[PDB]
Ligand binder design. Sequence first.
Ligand SMILES: [Ca+2]
Ligand SMILES: [Ca+2]
Ligand SMILES: [Ca+2]
Ligand SMILES: [Ca+2]
Ligand SMILES: [Ca+2]
Length: 323
Amino acid sequence: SASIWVGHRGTVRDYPDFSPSVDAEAIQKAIRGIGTDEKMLISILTERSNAQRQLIVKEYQAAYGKELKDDLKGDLSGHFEHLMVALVTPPAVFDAKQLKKSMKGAGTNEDALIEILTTRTSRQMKDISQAYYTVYKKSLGDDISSETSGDFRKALLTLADGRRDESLKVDEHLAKQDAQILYKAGENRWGTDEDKFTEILCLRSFPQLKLTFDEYRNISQKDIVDSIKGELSGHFEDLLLAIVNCVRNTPAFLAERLHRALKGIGTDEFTLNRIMVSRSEIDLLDIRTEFKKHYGYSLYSAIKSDTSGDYEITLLKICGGDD
Ligand SMILES: [Ca+2]
Ligand SMILES: [Ca+2]
Ligand SMILES: [Ca+2]
Ligand SMILES: [Ca+2]
Ligand SMILES: [Ca+2]
């Protein structure tokens, strides 16, 4: 058992000298009474992996009959609070909540839905579905079904099932047939067979899709991206382009979401928090590399320019270093 939630390029790793008891006691002393030692909280939680944080949570419950997340919510405020609670939340539960949050109210955050459902693996998606049910007592699919529609809805429902092929094997025969199908379902006909785009881009493994995009280019003499932009529109178009970019370079896709979250008028702290926390033990190092390659400046400096206080320090600790 390797964590489906832990990858090879994260910025946060297991603290080797970890002691749950010592950490829980330190956290308790830090929030206990008037004031809060935010510095102590930062020092500990950003320097422990999520798995260790879960052990601290368990220990804190045992020793104080208190839920660590509730004490954090009672003492902390703002972005710093949200970030800190995010850090102590199990990964599948964090994603499930982010998903609920993106569908909550009169509006839907299509970009957040796209981001999460396209970057999570089938295994993580199965975990997220289970967590969603546990926390909401409703399936993710039911919620998606009700807050979206059209082709966008159908593609999100296919991804939420976590049925994408996980095999390591590829089928050149299959890649050619699929590339022919995509060609025939789009460019080669008036209108588009949207369902066929959804089926192939959502159920074939990433490796398989990379072959299919090569064959497609051969058949059509155009990139799959060109076809998608010409045949589709709206959120559906955005979702399929997201799938293509993730197949080719997931860290660059996420580097781009971070970039938009930090630029313009007003930082999108929720996108920032989500990406920083959820990819910290997976590929934040690669996201850093891509961000710098694409924008010319490191993620570390982007954080430093648009954020401040304890919130900034925590993000910088998660970030891990400059590039
Ligand atoms: Ca306090
Ligand atoms: Ca809504
Ligand atoms: Ca067409
Ligand atoms: Ca159609
Ligand atoms: Ca278009």
